Amino acid sequence: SHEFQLATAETWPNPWPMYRALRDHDPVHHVVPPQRPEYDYYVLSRHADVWSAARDHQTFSSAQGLTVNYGELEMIGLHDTPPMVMQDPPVHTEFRKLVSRGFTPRQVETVEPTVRKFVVERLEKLRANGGGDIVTELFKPLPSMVVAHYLGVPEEDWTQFDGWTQAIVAANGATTGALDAVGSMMAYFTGLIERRRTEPADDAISHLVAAGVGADGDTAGTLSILAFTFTMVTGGNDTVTGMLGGSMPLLHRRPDQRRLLLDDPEGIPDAVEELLRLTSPVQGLARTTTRDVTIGDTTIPAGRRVLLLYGSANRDERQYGPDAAELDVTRCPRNILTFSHGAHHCLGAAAARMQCRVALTELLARCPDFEVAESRIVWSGGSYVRRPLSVPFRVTSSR
Amino acid sequence: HEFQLATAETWPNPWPMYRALRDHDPVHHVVPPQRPEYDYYVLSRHADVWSAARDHQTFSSAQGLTVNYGELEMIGLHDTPPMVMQDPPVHTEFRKLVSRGFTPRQVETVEPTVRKFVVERLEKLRANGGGDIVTELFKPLPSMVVAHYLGVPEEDWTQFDGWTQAIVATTGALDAVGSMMAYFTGLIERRRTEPADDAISHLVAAGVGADGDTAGTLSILAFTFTMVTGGNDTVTGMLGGSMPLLHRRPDQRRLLLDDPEGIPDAVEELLRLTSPVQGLARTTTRDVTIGDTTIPAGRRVLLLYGSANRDERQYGPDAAELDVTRCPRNILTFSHGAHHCLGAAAARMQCRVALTELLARCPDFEVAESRIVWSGGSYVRRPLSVPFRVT
Amino acid sequence: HEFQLATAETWPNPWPMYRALRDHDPVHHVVPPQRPEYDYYVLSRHADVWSAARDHQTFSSAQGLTVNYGELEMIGLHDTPPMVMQDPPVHTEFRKLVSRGFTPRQVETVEPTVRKFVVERLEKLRANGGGDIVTELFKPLPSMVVAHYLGVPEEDWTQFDGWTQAIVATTGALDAVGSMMAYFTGLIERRRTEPADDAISHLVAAGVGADGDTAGTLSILAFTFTMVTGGNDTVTGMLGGSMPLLHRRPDQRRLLLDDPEGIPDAVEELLRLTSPVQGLARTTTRDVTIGDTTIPAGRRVLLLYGSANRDERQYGPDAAELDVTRCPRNILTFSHGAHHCLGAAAARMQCRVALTELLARCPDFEVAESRIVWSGGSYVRRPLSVPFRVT
Amino acid sequence: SHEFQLATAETWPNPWPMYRALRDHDPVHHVVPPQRPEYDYYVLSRHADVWSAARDHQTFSSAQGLTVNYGELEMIGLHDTPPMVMQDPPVHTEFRKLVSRGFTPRQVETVEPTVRKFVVERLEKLRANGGGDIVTELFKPLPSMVVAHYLGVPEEDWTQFDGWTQAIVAANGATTGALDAVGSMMAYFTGLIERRRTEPADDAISHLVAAGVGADGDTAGTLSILAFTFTMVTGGNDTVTGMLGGSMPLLHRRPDQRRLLLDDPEGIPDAVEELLRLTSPVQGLARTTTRDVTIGDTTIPAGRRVLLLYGSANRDERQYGPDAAELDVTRCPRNILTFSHGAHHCLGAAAARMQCRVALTELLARCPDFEVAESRIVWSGGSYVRRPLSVPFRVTSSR
Ligand code: HEM
Ligand code: HEM
Ligand code: HEM
Ligand code: HEM
Ligand SMILES: Clc1ccc(CO[C@H](Cn2ccnc2)c2ccc(Cl)cc2Cl)cc1
Ligand SMILES: Clc1ccc(CO[C@H](Cn2ccnc2)c2ccc(Cl)cc2Cl)cc1
Ligand SMILES: Clc1ccc(CO[C@H](Cn2ccnc2)c2ccc(Cl)cc2Cl)cc1
Ligand SMILES: Clc1ccc(CO[C@H](Cn2ccnc2)c2ccc(Cl)cc2Cl)cc1
Numbered sequence A, D: 001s002h003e004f005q006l007a008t009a010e011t012w013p014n015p016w017p018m019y020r021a022l023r024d025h026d027p028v029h030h031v032v033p034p035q036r037p038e039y040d041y042y043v044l045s046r047h048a049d050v051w052s053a054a055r056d057h058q059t060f061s062s063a064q065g066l067t068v069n070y071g072e073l074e075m076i077g078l079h080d081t082p083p084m085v086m087q088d089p090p091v092h093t094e095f096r097k098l099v100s101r102g103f104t105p106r107q108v109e110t111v112e113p114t115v116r117k118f119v120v121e122r123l124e125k126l127r128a129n130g131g132g133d134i135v136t137e138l139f140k141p142l143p144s145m146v147v148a149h150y151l152g153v154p155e156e157d158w159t160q161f162d163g164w165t166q167a168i169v170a171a172n173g174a175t176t177g178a179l180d181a182v183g184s185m186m187a188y189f190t191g192l193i194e195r196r197r198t199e200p201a202d203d204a205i206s207h208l209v210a211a212g213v214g215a216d217g218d219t220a221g222t223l224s225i226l227a228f229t230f231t232m233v234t235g236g237n238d239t240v241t242g243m244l245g246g247s248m249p250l251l252h253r254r255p256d257q258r259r260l261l262l263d264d265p266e267g268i269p270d271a272v273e274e275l276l277r278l279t280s281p282v283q284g285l286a287r288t289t290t291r292d293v294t295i296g297d298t299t300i301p302a303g304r305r306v307l308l309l310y311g312s313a314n315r316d317e318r319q320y321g322p323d324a325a326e327l328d329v330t331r332c333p334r335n336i337l338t339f340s341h342g343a344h345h346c347l348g349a350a351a352a353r354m355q356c357r358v359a360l361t362e363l364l365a366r367c368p369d370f371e372v373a374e375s376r377i378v379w380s381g382g383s384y385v386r387r388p389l390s391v392p393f394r395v396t397s398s399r
Numbered sequence B, C: 001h002e003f004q005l006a007t008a009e010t011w012p013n014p015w016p017m018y019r020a021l022r023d024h025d026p027v028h029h030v031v032p033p034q035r036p037e038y039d040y041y042v043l044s045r046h047a048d049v050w051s052a053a054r055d056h057q058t059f060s061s062a063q064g065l066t067v068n069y070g071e072l073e074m075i076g077l078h079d080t081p082p083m084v085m086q087d088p089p090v091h092t093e094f095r096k097l098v099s100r101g102f103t104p105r106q107v108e109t110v111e112p113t114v115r116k117f118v119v120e121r122l123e124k125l126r127a128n129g130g131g132d133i134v135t136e137l138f139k140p141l142p143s144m145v146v147a148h149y150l151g152v153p154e155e156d157w158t159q160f161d162g163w164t165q166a167i168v169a170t171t172g173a174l175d176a177v178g179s180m181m182a183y184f185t186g187l188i189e190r191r192r193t194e195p196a197d198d199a200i201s202h203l204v205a206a207g208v209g210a211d212g213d214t215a216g217t218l219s220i221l222a223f224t225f226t227m228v229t230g231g232n233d234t235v236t237g238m239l240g241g242s243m244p245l246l247h248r249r250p251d252q253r254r255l256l257l258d259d260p261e262g263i264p265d266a267v268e269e270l271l272r273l274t275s276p277v278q279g280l281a282r283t284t285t286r287d288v289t290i291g292d293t294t295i296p297a298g299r300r301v302l303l304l305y306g307s308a309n310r311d312e313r314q315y316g317p318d319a320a321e322l323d324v325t326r327c328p329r330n331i332l333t334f335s336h337g338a339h340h341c342l343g344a345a346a347a348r349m350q351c352r353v354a355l356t357e358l359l360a361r362c363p364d365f366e367v368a369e370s371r372i373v374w375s376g377g378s379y380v381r382r383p384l385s386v387p388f389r390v391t
């Protein structure tokens, strides 16, 4: 297929061939914006290369940015960039230590029931109409509760909070309700932060406040806690949506794979893994070299940005065999990059996995013969996170 | 004595330490016993600092502006600007847009508004014999100008300054930040359909934040925050920092009293001696050699503007003292090069005004040096309290 | 349940967790939430652990033997051997010399001395109905043999064990370490002109420490320390660990009571089921692939000897239970390959003796499983207290 | 001159030409023991290369050993190796943090008087005999007091402690008094450690005990504190001796340089720096690569040991000019490697510097026209630390 090109809503449907293209012919692809040559960068597509890069945080930095956009830490450009910039060990270690305290196994169990309740409520509402938009009806609002949960947002506010969430996530002058939501969200948290100073819980934010972040005047601290929550509200929400929605077409395309999980629900957890591999909600993130580095026969100059195609890595035939491109709920894939590897390995991987499990389990139980109108599926914009905005669902069984 | 990052108790007199460095260790090496890897260098001579600032490709700003490699560690104590600028080409565009909010029309337009406040507050002080000139005037003063450049509508200036003064400060500032944050979100929204001439309007007009951006809208708020705090302290610093200087040299003030036509030139001298931004670091993007010393690539190098301005090698023997008639050239109070301060004009205007009115309405005033209280912070040197007395 | 490094409260029954791993996650990946970089793998199947241990060039020992990358951080809590062995070629020479202190003559020579103590203490216990068989016998017992291999003269064995028992334990052990340290320095000095057949004599005879070496003399002391502690706990572990097993399966004991000619074979079975050294890590020297999983170079990989020995894929369905008649082959209680235990013989002898005398003089004994107390430590599993009762 | 070859007492006199040889012709010299080829290693001699290597602790590890001896962390071989093995950041960071607490400026001031007292006592005793062995009479016992000081050894024990010190430092069956000293030293410290558990000072050791090292049973901890003290007693003692003694011939060879410091004692501190550069007590230490690394046109395989010739680096003409080999007390040398650079930059650099200053100052004041019988100077064994055992001194002025 075509050569590298950052993804758009139009290209998100089948980026797989471009990946194969790169993997089979330009493992270390050099991109040179024809107009702005000073912003050239590289793209890694082979599982092996992407894997090493992600892990070797010493050579491939994060604190410079996570996208191929050099103006990332400035003002112009942004739009498609994480709200917060992550540091590298040792600097990053304090943070990871503290925030991981709000990301324990109890955190998952404590909110799983809520997840299932909602999943079942919406699933049955859809069985009522014998169809609908499973993304709009379930996979979009679903993650918001988990994110609110991890952020330490009290139930009374859940209603209000989800409001703001949905206004912002919708961003991509309809986005005016967005600037508004952000402000609202903004003030809310400075409040919640205040509340936590003396009424701490065990949510990530409580552990940062309790640890002193944004304490006695420390403005920069408070600001970063905010940057964190907004990064969670935005990304933590639609990465899960991307997984759930993105899984629909994969399953639809193969009822035999669906049948396996039907006669034996035990395969679901493993299936979630295979689904995670193929969907790769976070298709790719970039790094900045901290010294001239040589991969294969290409030598990426220091200071250059390199995009790690996690999505291509999870589909690399070299790592997963000939059928890498196909769905195999029994595959039990090892070394997937869906959550990356190394210092920043996703803290909510078990939260996402739980959500996928509950969702897929309930779905397969109540809508054993669902169908997806692929052709009518809509993909969100952005070049890094691959999620669907709309997924025409329809249980070939009603009432 | 040996070099060391300043503190509120060491800010009263860093001058000797600077001389020491300029004279005996131009390219000073600091090696923290606890962390020899988190080592850095300190340039103190005017010629070097000047050349360093001008050479952005070699001395980058995109790594931080502090000598602390672990600055971005949420741990605590963040003596650092609420956000950091990139270097060209990246910075070029940003700077180009924001500079449209820093035009001559911009500075001129608010001057009258500023002079009025200065006079009102000065007279309020004469009506009391004295008072703390920093909290009473110098602190609130720079607040207005920031708002003016951020495009904050006048009616709000009262409510706004309300937060400003809480943030630049029992942490009710958290609330102040939330309020101000949300405030700006609306102002940005608004600016999408009412593009004035403020920096923010020019940014929003470019597409920043204008689209449920997030990140983009957050960087807008980071910038507004930098201005809100940095823009206050620096002016507060210079205006307050000038008090003891003018107090100590009555002969100088006399020159300005007999001939106020020399106040603009005095403003330069005062800026040279105050250097509110005593220093800011950079990070070598390659191994660079200065004199005998060679600084490895990726090393923080603190540019001591404050010292460079007092460098005898540049301003003569008396470089260390007040000479309102000096008319110093090439000062580094606003750095040099790609990051040269955009609010230099705005900064100068506030002092030309403030100083003129001070001298014109309180020709005879006294400052209790001994009772001045400096703020903390190793990079920006400003007084928290400067007891004033007109008589 | 999910995998996790053992603790004194989890040592009572790890068997289920192992099964789980062997059956569902042969090459288990552990990713610490606080430190995803300090991640590692856990091999639990006999075939893999066996192959891992045999392949030293790929799975090195010279990085540490714990899954904790920050093991050598003085911070605190050091669940790790008092020193670490290198891999061939380096290890080859060391092992060659030290192995001369682990000869057949060596094991045979002290057996009688050992059996006597066993009998004395066993009778002392019969004279009291019972007592704690670990503190009363199993703990002091392995002490003698170590001393014997370290070349500690018998008269001292009393004073020596004195320290041993203090160290293997209000930290009067610090003093015990100092005393023992100095003790060995003299013994080494001595050995320069009185080279016996102990391991130390063979080392000193080679030139180690013998020259105001330091380092060299300190490594001698590190080794003697490893032996002193490790060599005790492991045997203490196996002997004590066998108590509940023999207690639980009276039918088994009966087989040994009617025919004590089957005790040597029972010793193997008991070693297979106790695996005092439940596990020890290695560090991949290259990217290596096991099954679907690929472990990156420089990754700690915990070899679960304890699990490999209970692997049904190797010993059949009942692999999980006591069959003194089994005569298990290729157990991993003493690892395999370049680091295969040198004191395997010495270890086996102490149990052949201890067990025979136990069964011969207390055919009818009881162990209060419910009241056994395990020691801490995630790699060596031994009981601190095993209340004994003869009746 | 000849090709690389680890130093011996016989070769320590003038190793400078071998260095130049390497620098000018084999900057990345490959050494291959003819008999044990598996133990091949590399040697860096150019200031630039040695400097980068020392700093880049990520690539060039320390925790594997500090010498070119691969059996370093085992048993056979040792002899010429540090008693303790240093870790790499982050692991090493805790230690550095705690021990540096006992290495403050006060620590120097608090013991400087003692240094000067002793220096003057011995100097005058030598003026008495109008000569003697300045190493045996002063530069050998001198450092012991500072080391005892930093280790937190109470004055009453000073007598006893120095005894053991001298017995061990003498190591290189006369070394029998050594094995004895070590044992004595050994037990002493376990005691001192005990004492510190409740009677802590501000000496390095107190900070480790107070921090918990070797606490509630932690045997490994206690053992490492010991390894540290023995590393100080051995190395901390004779590196200073190497500097002081080694400086004698350098000064002797140039009375004009000595004259400068005579008419202006201010130059002494700077002189100490130039002396430090030329003496390089720690001529070199090795590192182990943690990945294939390429210097120039040579690519040192990972896992290989590399010797960083600090002594050659300080003499590199490229860094210090044409006269790099000569003494210039006004040179004011920048970037010297005498104390290394990076994570392990010597903690006692200011202590050594103080000693050199006091010594050199007193010497130049009381023995302005001393002489050294170079030909009769004796060098200690070992390939890493270059110190003299004997230095025939003689003030061409008596009484
Ligand atoms: C299927 C959904 C998800 C995917 C694919 C995903 C993916 C990722 C990836 C790849 C990273 C690291 C990016 C890099 O630097 O390469 C990351 C980090 C992280 N994720 Fe997720 N994530 C998901 C859901 C979540 C959720 C629901 C939460 C929160 C409840 C979460 C919390 C975080 C946090 C806090 C980190 C930062 C860890 C660090 O920097 O050490 N993620 N995620
Ligand atoms: C006493 C008065 C002030 C002083 C001494 C001061 C000093 C500085 C310095 C040293 C820099 C460059 C720092 C570096 O990169 O090393 C700077 C940049 C800047 N200042 Fe100020 N400043 C003052 C007042 C103001 C005010 C009131 C504003 C406007 C509201 C302002 C806006 C800025 C901006 C936006 C830049 C960044 C320019 C760029 O990055 O291209 N400054 N200032
Ligand atoms: C219950 C009895 C014992 C058990 C289960 C045991 C277990 C082990 C294991 C697992 C190893 C290899 C560890 C590895 O590298 O992964 C080992 C090595 C060794 N053991 Fe033991 N051991 C026991 C008793 C003893 C005794 C009493 C001595 C002798 C006094 C001894 C001396 C050693 C030595 C010196 C080695 C190292 C060999 C080498 O590195 O080449 N062991 N032991
Ligand atoms: C002229 C004399 C001395 C020289 C040339 C010297 C040299 C060195 C060097 C080169 C290192 C680091 C080696 C490497 O890894 O490359 C070192 C580390 C150190 N030195 Fe010295 N040293 C001297 C005197 C002392 C003294 C007197 C003390 C103690 C009072 C001392 C305490 C230490 C300590 C504790 C470190 C370890 C720091 C760390 O690992 O972070 N040194 N020394
Ligand atoms: Cl603290 C933190 C920082 C970064 C990331 C990861 O980057 C997030 C994805 N994400 C978010 C949550 N879980 C996954 C991201 C990528 C690309 C773009 Cl354009 C936007 C976003 Cl939000 C995760 C936590
Ligand atoms: Cl966009 C921008 C970024 C940085 C700077 C300059 O850095 C500011 C000073 N400042 C602020 C305004 N005018 C001057 C600063 C330095 C040190 C410390 Cl601790 C705090 C602050 Cl705020 C200027 C604009
Ligand atoms: Cl020279 C040598 C080095 C290591 C080992 C083996 O490692 C020992 C076990 N051990 C000791 C003796 N026989 C067995 C050990 C493991 C874990 C923990 Cl936490 C402590 C210890 Cl002590 C054996 C000789
Ligand atoms: Cl904690 C620590 C570890 C290592 C070193 C440094 O290595 C020391 C030199 N030294 C010692 C003190 N100051 C300098 C050394 C090198 C070579 C040889 Cl053969 C022996 C020794 Cl002792 C310094 C502290």
Ligand SMILES: [F-]
Residues within 6 Å of the ligand: A007, A008, A009, A010, A380, A381, A382
């Ligand atoms: F798009």
Ligand SMILES: [F-]
Residues within 6 Å of the ligand: A038, A039, A070, B089
């Ligand atoms: F660029």
Ligand SMILES: [F-]
Residues within 6 Å of the ligand: A048, A051, A052, A055, C287, C296, C297
């Ligand atoms: F890898």
Ligand SMILES: [F-]
Residues within 6 Å of the ligand: none
């Ligand atoms: F139901």
Ligand SMILES: [F-]
Residues within 6 Å of the ligand: A399
């Ligand atoms: F139904």
Ligand SMILES: [F-]
Residues within 6 Å of the ligand: B006, B007, B008, B009, B375, B376, B377
């Ligand atoms: F302060």
Ligand SMILES: [F-]
Residues within 6 Å of the ligand: B015, B016, B019, B320
């Ligand atoms: F001065």
Ligand SMILES: [F-]
Residues within 6 Å of the ligand: none
């Ligand atoms: F000069």
Ligand SMILES: [F-]
Residues within 6 Å of the ligand: A090, A091, B069, B070, B073
């Ligand atoms: F840090």
Ligand SMILES: [F-]
Residues within 6 Å of the ligand: B096
């Ligand atoms: F323009």
Ligand SMILES: [F-]
Residues within 6 Å of the ligand: B153, B196
């Ligand atoms: F307006």
Ligand SMILES: [F-]
Residues within 6 Å of the ligand: B314, B315, B326, B327, B328, B329
């Ligand atoms: F001038």
Ligand SMILES: [F-]
Residues within 6 Å of the ligand: B115, B352, B353, B356
């Ligand atoms: F005016």
Ligand SMILES: [F-]
Residues within 6 Å of the ligand: B367, B368, B369, B370, B371
């Ligand atoms: F005063």
Ligand SMILES: [F-]
Residues within 6 Å of the ligand: C006, C007, C008, C009, C375, C376, C377
């Ligand atoms: F435990």
Ligand SMILES: [F-]
Residues within 6 Å of the ligand: C015, C016, C019, C320
């Ligand atoms: F089981």
